[PDB]
Amino acid sequence: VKPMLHYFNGRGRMEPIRWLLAAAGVEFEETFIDTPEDFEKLKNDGSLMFQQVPMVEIDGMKLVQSRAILNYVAAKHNLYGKDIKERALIDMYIEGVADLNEMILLLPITPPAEKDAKIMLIKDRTTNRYLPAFEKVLKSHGEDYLVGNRLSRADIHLVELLYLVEELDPSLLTNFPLLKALKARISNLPTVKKFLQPGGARKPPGDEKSVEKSRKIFKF
């Protein structure tokens, strides 16, 4: 049976699960939360351990917590390294990805006065902290993948973040040629290609009106 993904019809916290399942070549289905009552239904079903989504029905579980879902998917589909040493590298890399992702994820709901400052900070962190660190990993071993010379969730999560960075400002990737190269190679894996092409499961960026709709469903 295909996993079932419960979320708003948008990127938010479910987008990295879509990318990772897609990258693993796993067909999945989505039940969109379009109304407050769609959300209320999942809570009243007892489906949500913490009264929150993402939730993914997979292998007889109703998994909540984005990290728990990703860890399970990655381990099941051999995208979490070969040994605990490789996992330690993967985990360290993707937790960095997670921190920069979280800043970008919450930009839309930043108090309007400090939004410019927040964009400056994200660009500063992007160019001076995160991308330098990942560029140095690729520089150090000259291999096609971040870890174990093999495709892992680290490649998928980083490449998903490079697309977001490019959407924020394409000049931010200018000084990171090895990361641009990763992005091009990962984008051309058969499974990721289908995911990114027209009609794939990838979600578009939100607008003023998708933000307003999500805010009256989730309260933020």
Ligand X SMILES: N[C@@H](CCC(=O)N[C@@H](CS)C(=O)NCC(=O)O)C(=O)O
Applying CB under 8 A, the residues found at the interface with a copy of itself are: 49-51, 59, 61, 63-68, 71-72, 75-76, 84-85, 87-88, 91-92, 95-96, 99, 129-130, 133
Cβ of residue 12: shortest distance to ligand X, in angstroms?
5
Tokens in use for 49?
A: 């351990």
Instruction: Examine residue 145 and tell whether it contacts ligand X (CB under 6 A).
Output: no
Chain length of the chain:
220
Tokens in use for 141?
A: 């071993």
Instruction: Examine residue 52 and tell whether it contacts ligand X (CB under 6 A).
Output: yes
Taking the least distance from each CB to a copy of itself, the nearer of 66 and 210 is 66
Taking the least distance from each CB to ligand X, the nearer of 40 and 167 is 40
Taking the least distance from each CB to a copy of itself, the nearer of 10 and 96 is 96
Does 67 belong to an annotated binding site? no
Stretch that binds ligand X, among 46-54, 78-86, 160-168, 198-206 (CB under 6 A): 46-54
With CA atoms as reference, report the closest residue to 160 among 21, 5, 49. 21
Residue with tokens 């860890």: 71
Tokens in use for 184?
A: 């091009």
Tokens in use for 98?
A: 């997670």
Cβ of residue 129: shortest distance to a copy of itself, in angstroms?
6
Q: At what angle do helices 153-168 and 84-105 cross, to 10 degrees?
A: 20
Q: What is the DSSP letter of 129?
A: I
Residues 11-40, interacting with ligand X (CB under 6 A): 12-13
Taking the least distance from each CB to ligand X, the nearer of 47 and 65 is 65
Phi, psi of 218 (to 5 degrees): -110, -20
What residues line the site for ligand X (CB under 6 A)?
Answer: 12-13, 51-54, 65-66, 95, 99, 218
